[PDB]
């Protein structure tokens, strides 16, 4: 039962990868996103990833091909690496500016209060920062 | 009497380890590189390796620390690495096998450059690198 | 009461962790090397201030008697943070062993495990801030 909010989330996800917004994700854009989260896939590995879901033989990911990538590679059940990515100064917490820096690096423009609202939504213990438990919760 | 070519070789070597190119080698990058050559060092073993040469107490390898690592651990084991290179196990390393090893190591080389590497290391002129030629190549 | 030769030897070993060329004096450069091996990045002026405080005769370096005088004297949450490298709030066996190796006292896993177990109060296998302060 597809609904509009689901599609909006899919499109936000796709925008996180399609940096120039030209409708397809290239190997460069995919590799950039994977680098921003602490990984170094090679040109050949990225071409392999895209080739497994490419349907029109152009070496780039369009929207349905991206949804298929999600279906194939995402699973319910590595996390500490992502937390460390967000946790810039290594104090065990993700501050508002650290979240803002990650968001910005992903091409997302959020105002100060918007980042604070994200933090507040995910901040259970109310200390003003995101720890590992809260990060895992907001990621699943 | 350090020379420009030697510094270029030191930096090529360091680039083989500093995958993200941020100036220092982490335990993650060192472990990835060592796994690419058929070894499974543990987190603690990698931390120990870096600790024996660490001069600024951050658990990562910078350039002088990397040169010191070379001076300490290089000596005047090879069969495992050769087997790693020899993908199809026929006792020879072809151009595509060498090219894949190069790619996996984050090295971007054109086709003719790989052929020139073969030409340099292929003594008996058969167009592939056997074990003797592989060992001799890892000295010059 | 006179010191034993083993006492003097241990004092000289601790001094030699700073006086690394073994010429009997600790310069600002050598103290900086130590502090950097610990992860800190003190400026030359901070190092000079440390020296000045400890250099009672004013010749610009620390010698063995001045070092001993400092030893007779004993926040420290920064010293703890220096040992706790991953910042999880505890000092692990690997962390203590690595710190000591960088300082110049290479210890074995066995020795460090035993040493931490002897200083371990709550018995969780790691030295927390309170145990660190209590030992100090
Ligand atoms: Ca694009
Ligand atoms: Ca496509
Ligand atoms: Ca943080
Ligand atoms: Ca929180
Ligand atoms: Ca690096
Ligand atoms: Ca280092
Ligand atoms: Ca082969
Ligand atoms: Ca040959
Ligand atoms: Ca000295
Ligand atoms: Ca003096
Ligand atoms: Ca720790
Ligand atoms: Ca304890």
């Amino acid at each position: 039962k597809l609904t509009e909010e689901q599609i909006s989330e899919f499109k936000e996800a796709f925008s996180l990868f399609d940096k120039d917004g030209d409708g397809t994700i290239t190997t460069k854009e995919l590799g950039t996103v994977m680098r921003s989260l602490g990984q170094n896939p090679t040109e050949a590995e990225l071409q392999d990833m895209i080739n497994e879901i490419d349907t029109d033989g152009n070496g780039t990911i369009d929207f349905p091909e991206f949804l298929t990538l999600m279906a194939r590679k995402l699973k319910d059940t590595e996390l500490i690496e992502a937390f460390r990515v967000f946790d810039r100064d290594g104090d065990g917490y993700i501050s508002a500016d650290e979240l803002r820096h990650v968001m910005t690096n992903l091409g997302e423009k959020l105002t100060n209060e918007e980042v604070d609202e994200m933090i507040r939504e995910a901040d259970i213990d109310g200390d003003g920062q995101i720890n590992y438990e809260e990060f895992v919760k907001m990621m699943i």
Side-chain angles (χ1 to χ4, degrees), chain A residues 2-10 12-27 29-72 74 82-83 85-99 101-108 110-119 121-123 125-128 131-132 134-135 138 140:
Chain A
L2 191 75
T3 61
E4 288 190 68
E5 184 58 23
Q6 197 181 11
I7 299 164
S8 74
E9 302 185 0
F10 293 154
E12 198 57 63
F14 187 83
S15 76
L16 294 180
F17 291 80
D18 183 16
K19 296 292 185 196
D20 67 349
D22 74 333
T24 48
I25 308 164
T26 64
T27 289
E29 298 173 325
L30 180 64
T32 297
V33 173
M34 295 191 68
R35 283 166 245 162
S36 294
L37 281 74
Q39 305 213 119
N40 300 104
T42 65
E43 177 68 18
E45 287 173 326
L46 298 164
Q47 289 189 352
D48 280 9
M49 296 177 214
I50 296 174
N51 189 72
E52 289 158 19
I53 51 81
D54 198 8
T55 61
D56 52 7
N58 59 4
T60 65
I61 313 170
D62 69 4
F63 203 90
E65 294 170 349
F66 175 83
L67 304 176
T68 303
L69 177 61
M70 279 172 61
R72 253 182 238 187
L74 192 143
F83 180 78
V85 161
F86 285 65
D87 184 14
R88 178 169 56 196
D89 66 3
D91 68 333
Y93 303 101
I94 306 167
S95 75
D97 185 73
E98 299 178 310
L99 178 56
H101 182 73
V102 173
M103 292 304 92
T104 305
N105 192 10
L106 296 174
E108 199 61 273
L110 304 173
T111 73
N112 187 83
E113 185 56 25
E114 288 183 345
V115 170
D116 286 322
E117 260 140 0
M118 288 178 68
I119 293 283
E121 193 282 336
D123 176 26
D125 66 350
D127 62 357
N131 59 31
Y132 180 73
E134 299 158 344
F135 176 77
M138 182 184 64
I140 311 308

